[PDB]
């Protein structure tokens, strides 16, 4: 049943790091501007736990300077208010985030010229962060998705090279293990889960922005190309709403897109369903 869930987009980058928090309703195609982040942020990740939206890491860059963010903030849709939470052990720009058992996992990202392979876990009910096992690879601009309590970190940049590799995190054993490498090198790709596959849409391969999209079926352990998006894009927002994948904005190598595309896995098609109120990349996106 359709209960009215919305797609939230937080922060992002256009001309500088943005504060913006907006919600889109796929049912009527309307947008609603909500309370601003207390601190502008691009390259952050967004996620939802217990009906609350969380903005994680990222960075604030403008003429007033460049500062990587270790912050965690919690937005309550019911009160339309942001609340500061406990910060991570380190600033994490171009971070990847995933949720398991109501816990927020902050993966990789960077702080200055430091490229994190480290990972830490946040427990809402205790407002406390905890270091877990580090990834086998240093990854900033990594994409993250979770399927059946297993977390996947896809692609990114290790400081020297851009990766087509990916790895899986086993939360209860607290380990990481490499999985099949993608067909394409991708950093800043949109990564999400839909049914039994992890999608890796767009990204930057080191020379061009990508509009190609491939998915990893956890059952067959293979990476498969599906239909390409209309726009190439890296640093795109991505989420799933009522069985379909939605990609928001990103950079196509020329413009900061306002375009929103929707992927229908049954017909293996993407189509443009709306536009953001303004183009932007590096947003955090989540559904509730
Ligand atoms: O590193 C990559 O290959 C892809 O770049 C990514 C990856 C993941 C998220 C993002 C979000 N983009 C982003 O934060 N862009 C941005 N942030 N600060 C700036 C900026 C530009 C000039 C001064 O500051 O541009 C980019």
Beta carbons of 214 and 223 less than 8 angstroms apart: yes
Nearest CA to ligand 1 atom 4: 188
Strand order in the sheet with 175-178: 143-147, 150-157, 162-170, 175-178
| Cα-to-centroid distance, 286 and ligand 1 (Å) | 19
- Name the residue of 16, 141, 154, 159 whose CB sits within 8 Å of the most ligand 1 atoms, as the mutation to test its pocket: 141
Dihedral sign for Cα 106, 108, 109, 114, please.
Answer: positive
Neighbouring C-beta atoms of residue 131, cutoff 10 Å = 12
| Cα-to-centroid distance, 75 and ligand 1 (Å) | 23
What's the rounded Cα separation, in Å, for the pair 96 and 251? 18
Entry field: residues in the chain = 288
| Cα-to-centroid distance, 240 and ligand 1 (Å) | 23
Beta carbons of 232 and 253 less than 8 angstroms apart: yes
What's the rounded Cα separation, in Å, for the pair 45 and 9? 10
What's the rounded Cα separation, in Å, for the pair 5 and 216? 27
| Cα-to-centroid distance, 79 and ligand 1 (Å) | 31
Beta carbons of 197 and 217 less than 8 angstroms apart: yes
- Ligand 1 cavity residues, CB under 6 Å: 13, 42-43, 61, 94, 141, 157, 187-188, 204, 234-235, 281-282
Which residues contact residue 169 at a Cβ distance below 8 angstroms, ignoring those fewer than 6 apart?
105, 119, 132, 133, 135, 150, 151, 152, 153, 175, 176
Nearest CA to ligand 1 atom 23: 61
What's the rounded Cα separation, in Å, for the pair 105 and 36? 24
CA atoms within 13 A on the CB side of 254: 2
Core vs surface per residue 189-215: b (16+ CB within 10 A) or e: bbbbbbeebbbbbbbbbeeebbbbbbb
At 215, which CATH number? 2.120.10.80
Resolution as reported, in Å: 2.1
Which range of residues forms the domain containing residue 6?
1-288
> Which one, of 276, 279, 246, 283, lies nearest residue 261 by Cα?
246
Which residues contact residue 207 at a Cβ distance below 8 angstroms, ignoring those fewer than 6 apart?
none
Method used to obtain the model:
X-ray
Total structural domains within the chain: 1
CA atoms within 13 A on the CB side of 206: 12
Core vs surface per residue 54-71: b (16+ CB within 10 A) or e: bbbbbbbbeeeeeebbbb
> Which one, of 171, 165, 129, 134, lies nearest residue 151 by Cα?
171
Burial class (CB in 10 A: 0-12, 13-18, 19+), 4: exposed
Q: What is the largest CA-CA distance in the chain?
A: 49
C-alpha distances out from residue 241 to 139, 217, 287, Å: 27, 20, 7
> Which one, of 101, 14, 100, 89, lies nearest residue 56 by Cα?
89
């Amino acid at each position: 049943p359709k209960v009215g869930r919305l797609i939230y987009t937080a922060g992002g980058y256009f001309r500088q790091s943005l504060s913006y928090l907006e919600a889109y309703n796929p049912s009527d195609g309307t947008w609603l501007r909500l309370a601003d982040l207390q601190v502008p942020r691009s390259g952050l990740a967004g996620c939802v736990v217990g009906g609350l939206l969380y903005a994680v890491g990222g960075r604030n860059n403008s003429p007033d300077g460049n500062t990587d963010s270790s912050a965690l903030d919690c937005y309550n849709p019911m009160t339309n208010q942001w609340s500061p939470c406990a910060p991570m052990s380190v600033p994490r720009n171009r971070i990847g985030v995933g949720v398991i058992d109501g816990h927020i996992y902050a993966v990789g990202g960077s702080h200055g010229c430091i490229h994190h392979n480290s990972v830490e876990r946040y427990e809402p009910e205790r407002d406390e962060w905890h270091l877990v096992a580090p990834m086998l690879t240093r990854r900033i601009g990594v994409g993250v998705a979770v399927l059946n309590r297993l977390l996947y970190a896809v692609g990114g940049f290790d400081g020297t090279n851009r990766l087509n590799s990916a790895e899986c995190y086993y939360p209860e054993r607290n380990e990481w293990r490499m999985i099949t490498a993608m067909n394409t090198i991708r950093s800043g790709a949109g990564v999400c889960v839909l049914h039994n596959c992890i999608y890796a849409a767009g990204g930057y391969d080191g020379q061009d922005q990508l509009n190609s999209v491939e998915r990893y079926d956890v059952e067959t352990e293979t990476w498969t190309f599906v239909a390409p998006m209309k726009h190439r894009r890296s640093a795109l927002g991505i989420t799933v709403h009522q069985g379909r994948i939605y990609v928001l904005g990103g950079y196509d190598g020329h413009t900061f897109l306002d375009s929103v595309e929707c992927y229908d896995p049954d017909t293996d098609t993407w189509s443009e369903v709306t536009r953001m109120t303004s183009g932007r990349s590096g947003v955090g996106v989540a559904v509730t």
